[PDB]
Design a protein around this nucleic acid. Structure first.
Ligand SMILES: *C(=O)c1nc2ccccc2cc1O
Ligand SMILES: *C(=O)c1nc2ccccc2cc1O
Length: 8
DNA sequence: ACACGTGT
DNA sequence: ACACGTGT
Protein backbone atom coordinates (compact mmCIF):
# COMPACT_ATOMS: atom_id res chain seq x y z
CA UNK A 1 0.00 0.00 0.00
CA UNK A 2 2.75 2.71 0.57
CA UNK A 3 4.86 4.40 -2.25
CA UNK A 4 8.37 5.12 -1.13
CA UNK A 5 10.40 3.06 -4.89
CA UNK A 6 7.04 1.52 -6.17
CA UNK A 7 3.44 2.38 -4.92
CA UNK A 8 1.12 -0.52 -4.64
C1' DA B 1 -2.10 -15.85 -0.72
C1' DC B 2 -0.51 -11.77 -4.03
C1' DA B 3 1.29 -7.12 -4.75
C1' DC B 4 6.67 -3.11 -4.55
C1' DG B 5 10.83 -0.86 -6.58
C1' DT B 6 13.73 3.98 -6.87
C1' DG B 7 16.41 7.10 -4.06
C1' DT B 8 19.06 8.17 -1.15
C1' DA C 1 22.45 0.80 5.41
C1' DC C 2 17.40 2.96 5.52
C1' DA C 3 13.04 3.61 3.47
C1' DC C 4 6.88 0.76 3.07
C1' DG C 5 1.83 -0.04 3.99
C1' DT C 6 -3.53 -0.81 2.22
C1' DG C 7 -6.40 -3.74 -0.82
C1' DT C 8 -7.86 -7.24 -2.53
C1 LIG D 1 0.83 -2.06 1.06
O1 LIG D 1 0.28 -1.84 2.15
C2 LIG D 1 1.57 -3.24 0.94
N1 LIG D 1 2.14 -3.46 -0.25
C3 LIG D 1 2.89 -4.54 -0.49
C4 LIG D 1 3.41 -4.64 -1.78
C5 LIG D 1 4.20 -5.75 -2.09
C6 LIG D 1 4.44 -6.72 -1.12
C7 LIG D 1 3.89 -6.60 0.17
C8 LIG D 1 3.09 -5.50 0.52
C9 LIG D 1 2.52 -5.30 1.75
C10 LIG D 1 1.76 -4.18 1.96
O2 LIG D 1 1.18 -3.98 3.21
C1 LIG E 1 11.58 1.24 -3.71
O1 LIG E 1 12.20 0.85 -4.70
C2 LIG E 1 11.81 0.58 -2.50
N1 LIG E 1 11.14 1.04 -1.44
C3 LIG E 1 11.26 0.50 -0.23
C4 LIG E 1 10.52 1.11 0.76
C5 LIG E 1 10.62 0.57 2.06
C6 LIG E 1 11.45 -0.52 2.30
C7 LIG E 1 12.20 -1.10 1.27
C8 LIG E 1 12.12 -0.59 -0.03
C9 LIG E 1 12.82 -1.09 -1.10
C10 LIG E 1 12.67 -0.52 -2.33
O2 LIG E 1 13.37 -1.04 -3.40
Amino acid sequence: XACXXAXX
